[PDB]
């Protein structure tokens, strides 16, 4: 279960979305749809918008382990 406190960051993250569904249900919904979210694996795209993505705003936003780089696998 989940008993921790929801800070302002998580509230602002779920506020800017458009689903109004918790993450545990949204992830299950996205996992239940595999035939529509299929894409090329290992192909660098230059569209910055994936298939599981969708509606977005035209306004620009530049709001502000964080020093190194996960190479492939950090067990």
């Amino acid at each position: 279960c989940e008993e921790g406190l929801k800070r302002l960051q998580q509230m602002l993250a779920e506020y800017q979305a458009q689903s109004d569904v918790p993450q545990e249900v949204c992830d299950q919904i996205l996992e239940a749809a595999k035939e529509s979210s299929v894409g090329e694996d290992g192909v660098r795209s230059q569209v910055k918008i994936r298939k599981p993505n969708g509606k977005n705003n035209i306004r620009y936003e530049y709001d502000l382990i964080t020093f190194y780089r996960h190479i492939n696998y950090s067990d």
């Binding site: 929801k6 689903s19 249900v25 996992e31 705003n57 035209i58 780089r69 492939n72």
Partner: protein, 964 residues
């Protein structure tokens, strides 16, 4: 373990951990319970440690005695080495990248490193009690006893104010917490120093029951206040079992040492682990037929990990360092460099672009250098706070308020943002300023009596949240006045979602806790069958089925989709670790080819081949295209596309220039130039094309209110409190609309059952059990469409014209058959690349990061586009500067073509307009410009919005590419 709310599985010990203060610097002050061995008193009560009091009983023989609870130790990794004898330096240095340096003659520990940038310094008083805690050098914390050796208050040593107020009782144990936030949590124990009940500050009380007596008791029947968490534990020998409030029993079997050997599931899934007598896992057995074998060399380090019917990772270390080389059993392999100071540098991944790091006399990073730009610069003051940060040439500025919280942010364009703070954290207001005296886009946040967000005020409205005393978002109130409520069940699972209209979305869960059925507002049903590993196998839609099938490796292999007619039968071939490269169906067989190091240098789409070349820095240059035409792409500093050249000498080049913020600012050619100008917030307000000027004027609600055009254009829009378009006036007339605050027409010529419309503007539509529009009868025109089993249009007729569509194995349209002929399309990933209409090859060029078209090549000629801030093509002109294509779109998005010298099927964003059906198909769906809504539902209906047929709030400031 920790299966119970906070209880163990190998034993009945109850362990609970809470944090008292959470400073923005990174200081953490926690405390554990440790029900086992709760007879001693360390100054914080019977069996209570503040997680900052370490104690080595003797010089080396005795245990370190962690707060949670050479003579090398292979099982745990201890490396306690003595030092100079007078001042007894020990420096435990266990295998958990810690270092507990203790000193004799004073009995205290200091220099607790937790990485490279995490340190702690202690300072005790004349007695054996700590009185000062510091991060690196400056005073941070301060204790205050009550002349009995019991901690009560905790000061900040910079501002006189209590942080945590412990409240004890007549039994020498705390019964109150009073933490930093100001939430008092009560605890009542038994007569043997065993916890009995714990009352949360919100009002939820947990209870505990013990079976045994003393320190060897077992905690069973851990129930809540109203049966929300009804956990029943049962221990017998070396096997334990526990069941939650949903009658789901999970069993575990351990060994004598205490490691996990076997784990069972109420469905039948079993996990097994076999060790190699040295405390390291050797064999792992999953519920499915697959065994993972670990192989270790001297000192272990997990040098080999082989999976059944697969490959191995083969980690690498030189003598004692971190990961030095990663094999990556695919065509690539990567490496790094590690000296005996940390600061990993010279990381060579699959491609080039090595990563160099330059530091200062301290341990923080200063400069991060890569190939072809991508340089990161950081500036540090006398303290550890960041001052200047440059990622791509911005050089932002940060100003503090004599505290550890950011107060002001300065941009290189003059925009200054100021943040206000109260006596606590949880910032409540943020404002943005400019070079002039004005206010814009200011957000406020107000909290309730607890530490939860109560309401948020935005220039658009006010959104409120009401909790059910458990922090689960019981209800949400919109600025308009409507409310959305949630109803949960045992174990806090989402069950019902109700809104103001009256319809309710329902969910169902199986014995494993996964989603096993959804009932929508209009009325649907699902099963969501899963295998013994947690992967969807059968969708089991009320009318159709998908029938996934894997290849016992973790990737999808086959899709036998079909509801009795028009079977799909999609096939794929995944390799070890991705690299699909193959997708076959009855219509298209997409194939791909990779290089040695790994690069999509050759793609095959039926009978067409594209091909492309990569550079040393991984950038794609000299792009190859069929019919023997090639492009040339150049770059510059910071790694951005600024020059595009063609293989034909009779074609001009395009030059791009960015602003100080990193956005596309100017695009120019030999006979064309486009300039864009913002207002300082991030919204386009002015556009110039050297002969055409467009301006945008916003209202107080941050919405496009007026659009002024030089060529006889002045359009005005007025919206409602939510944002839906209420009225629009272009030149002489005002068109008005209405809605029910949910995306449905509420005029006198509307009719909806639950969410779908039945009649609009005298046009009737028919829906089937799946929810798609199969029949459309207007004012004398009947249109009948037949779809596939994957919610995609197959054929359309009824208007004295037959049209058929054929897609690939990825859902992209490949063939379109109609009365005009056969049209073949060429896709590049998720964006349309070109098309063939048996009369030549057309190539569509778009922006490097967006879907805005710029130029189109046809018959050795190039035509430049002119679009607005939305991204829809408005004008198209040749190289001579004459009007070749010009049209005007309405509020709904209907094309009114005036000059039709050349055909232009482009639309808002990546969509394709059909001449025979008047529909916009972008990637997987169809949009009707004469209606304003889609004709079919998407599989992201509940995770993409409330209304399933709604495109957007308003097509003036919102886009929706890639279909759903």
């Amino acid at each position: 373990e920790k299966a119970g709310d906070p209880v163990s599985l190998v034993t009945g010990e109850e362990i609970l951990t809470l944090n008292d203060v959470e400073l923005p610097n990174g200081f953490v002050w926690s405390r554990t319970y440790r029900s086992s061995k709760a007879s001693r008193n360390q100054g914080l009560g019977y069996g209570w440690r503040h997680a900052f009091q370490f104690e080595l009983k003797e010089v080396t023989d005795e245990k370190h005695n962690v707060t949670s609870w050479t003579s090398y130790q292979v099982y745990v990794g201890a490396s306690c080495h003595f030092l100079n004898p007078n001042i007894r330096i020990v420096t435990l240095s266990s295998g958990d990248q810690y270092r507990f340096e203790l000193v004799e003659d004073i009995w205290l520990l200091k220099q607790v490193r937790n990485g490279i940038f995490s340190t702690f310094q202690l300072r005790y008083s004349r007695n054996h009690r700590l009185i000062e805690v510091a991060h690196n050098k400056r005073p941070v914390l301060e204790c205050q006893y009550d002349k009995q050796g019991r901690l009560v208050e905790l000061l900040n040593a910079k501002t006189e104010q209590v942080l945590t107020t412990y409240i004890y009782d007549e039994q020498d144990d705390l019964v109150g917490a009073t933490n930093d936030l100001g939430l008092t949590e009560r605890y009542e124990y038994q007569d043997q120093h065993l916890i009995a009940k714990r009352v949360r500050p919100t009002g939820f009380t947990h209870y505990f029951e013990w079976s045994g007596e003393g320190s060897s008791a077992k905690c069973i029947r851990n129930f809540g206040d109203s049966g929300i968490y009804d956990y029943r534990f049962h221990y017998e020998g070396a096997k334990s079992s526990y069941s939650d409030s949903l009658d789901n029993e999970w069993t575990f079997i351990h060994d004598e040492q205490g490691h996990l050997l076997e784990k069972s599931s109420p469905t039948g899934r079993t996990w097994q682990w076999h060790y190699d007598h040295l405390g390291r896992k050797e064999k792992a057995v999953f519920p499915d037929n697959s065994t993972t074998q670990y192989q270790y060399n001297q000192q272990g380090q997990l040098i080999s990990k082989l999976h059944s019917s697969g490959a191995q990772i083969q980690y690498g270390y030189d003598s004692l360092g971190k990961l030095v080389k990663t094999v990556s059993p695919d065509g690539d392999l990567e490496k790094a460099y590690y000296n005996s100071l940390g600061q990993r540098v010279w990381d060579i991944d699959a491609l080039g672009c090595v990563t160099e790091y330059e530091y200062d006399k301290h341990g923080q990073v200063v400069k991060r250098e890569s190939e072809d730009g991508k340089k990161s610069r950081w500036w540090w003051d006398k303290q550890q706070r960041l001052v200047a940060h440059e990622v791509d040439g911005t050089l932002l500025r940060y100003s503090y308020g004599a505290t550890d919280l950011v107060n002001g942010i300065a941009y290189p364009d003059g925009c200054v943002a100021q943040i206000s703070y109260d006596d606590y954290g949880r910032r409540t207001s943020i404002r943005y300023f400019n070079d002039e005296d004005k206010v814009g886009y200011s957000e406020e946040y107000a909290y309730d009596e607890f530490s939860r967000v109560a309401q948020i005020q935005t220039p658009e409205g006010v959104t409120s949240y009401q909790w059910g005393a458990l922090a689960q978002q019981e209800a949400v109130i919109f600025p308009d006045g409507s409310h959305i409520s949630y109803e949960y069940d045992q174990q806090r699972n989402l069950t019902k979602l109700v809104r103001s209209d009256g319809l309710a979305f329902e969910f169902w869960y199986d014995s494993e806790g996964l989603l096993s059925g959804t009932v929508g507002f209009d009325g649907l049903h699902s099963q969501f069958k899963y295998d013994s590993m947690g992967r969807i196998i059968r969708k089991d839609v009320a009318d159709r089925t998908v029938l996934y099938s894997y290849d016992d490796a973790g990737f999808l292999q086959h899709i036998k989709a079909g509801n009795g007619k028009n079977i799909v039968e999609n096939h794929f071939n995944y390799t070890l670790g991705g690299r699909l490269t193959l997708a076959s169906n009855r219509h298209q067989t997409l194939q791909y080819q990779y290089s040695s190091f790994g690069h999509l240098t050759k793609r095959i789409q039926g009978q067409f081949e594209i091909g492309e070349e990569f550079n040393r820095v991984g950038q794609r240059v000299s792009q190859t295209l069929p019919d023997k035409t090639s492009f040339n792409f150049s770059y510059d500093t910071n790694g951005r596309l600024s020059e595009i050249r063609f293989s034909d000498d009779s074609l001009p080049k395009i030059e791009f220039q960015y602003d100080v913020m990193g956005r596309l600012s100017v695009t120019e050619t030999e006979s064309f130039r486009e300039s864009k100008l913002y207002d300082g917030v991030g919204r386009l307000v002015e556009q110039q094309w050297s002969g055409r000027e467009k301006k945008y004027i916003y209202n107080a609600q941050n919405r496009i209110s007026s659009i002024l055009d030089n060529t006889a254009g002045a359009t005005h829009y007025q919206y409602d409190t939510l944002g839906y378009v209420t009225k629009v006036s272009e030149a002489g007339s005002t068109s008005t609309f209405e809605s029910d605050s949910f995306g449905n027409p509420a005029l006198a010529d509307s009719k909806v059952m639950s969410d779908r419309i039945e009649a609009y503007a005298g046009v009737r539509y028919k829906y089937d059990q799946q929810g798609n529009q199969v029949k459309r009868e207007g004012d004398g025109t009947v249109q009948k469409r037949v779809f596939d089993a994957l919610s995609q249009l197959v054929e359309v007729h009824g208007d004295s014209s037959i049209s058929h569509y054929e897609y690939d194995a990825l859902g992209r349209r490949t063939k379109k058959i109609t009365q005009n002929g056969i049209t073949e399309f060429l896709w590049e990933g998720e964006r349309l690349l070109g098309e063939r209409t048996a009369d030549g090859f057309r190539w569509y060029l778009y922006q490097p990061e967006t879907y805005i078209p710029l130029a189109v090549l046809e018959n050795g000629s190039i035509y430049l586009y002119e679009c607005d801030q939305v991204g829809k093509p408005e004008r198209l002109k040749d190289s001579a500067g004459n009007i070749v294509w010009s049209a005007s779109y309405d509020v709904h998005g209907f094309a009114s073509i005036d000059v039709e010298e050349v055909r232009n099927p482009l639309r808002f964003q990546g969509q394709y307009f059909d001449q025979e059906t008047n529909l916009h198909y972008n990637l997987a769906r169809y949009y009707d410009p004469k209606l304003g809504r889609f004709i079919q539902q998407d599989p992201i209906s509940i995770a993409g919005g409330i209304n399933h047929y709604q495109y957007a709030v308003n097509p003036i400031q919102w886009i929706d590419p890639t279909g759903f």
